[PDB]
Amino acid sequence: SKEALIQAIILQDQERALARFREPIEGIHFVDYMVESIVSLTHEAFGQRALVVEIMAEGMRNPQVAAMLKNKHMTITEFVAQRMRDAQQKGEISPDINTAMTSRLLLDLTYGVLADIEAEDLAREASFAQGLRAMIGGILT
């Protein structure tokens, strides 16, 4: 079945995301870390990014795939929120933010950048990382 193959690809895509956030972030401001995490998406293999978006499109017309993506996005956002709480205790970001919602909106900005066909060209401009820095630092402070 097609759903079984998609589920295996989702776990592999999820694993690349978990590698960014599974460990405590030492010696790096969380705003600087989130900026580099989203900017580095533009340099991953394009066919790998295209496969993520193809599965995202399938999930919007396939309830079984939508359930797999709900689990994938839940898993990623819980780890991002944990690193967010670490930054709050270290005094790096505001202790008043809604970490669950903030992680979800950061993940949506992530997939919006991931799906941009011209993201690699935009990343060559200095205003690309600065604009992301202003968006990311804005919601975290």
What is each CA distance from 38 to 25, 41, 45, 135, in whole angstroms? 16, 5, 14, 11
Tokens coding 106: 């950061």
Contact yes or no for 114/52 (Cβ under 8 A): yes
Considering the complex, what minimum distance in angstroms separates the CB of residue 3 from ligand C3G? 17
Helices (DSSP H) in 29-98: which residue ranges?
30-39, 46-59, 63-89
Tell me the C-alpha distance between 42 and 4, whole Å: 28
Binding of its own copies at residue 138 (CB under 8 A)? yes
Q: Which does 139 bind (CB under 5 to 8 A by kind): ligand C3G, its own copies, none?
A: its own copies
Considering the complex, what minimum distance in angstroms separates the CB of residue 118 from ligand C3G? 15
Binding of ligand C3G at residue 81 (CB under 6 A)? no
Whose Cβ is closer to its own copies: residue 28's or residue 50's? 50
Q: Which does 17 bind (CB under 5 to 8 A by kind): ligand C3G, its own copies, none?
A: ligand C3G
Host H or E run for residue 133: helix 126-140
Report the interface residues with its own copies, using CB under 8 A.
46-47, 49-50, 53-54, 56-61, 66, 69-70, 73, 98, 101-102, 104-105, 108-113, 115-119, 122, 125, 127-128, 131-132, 134-139, 141
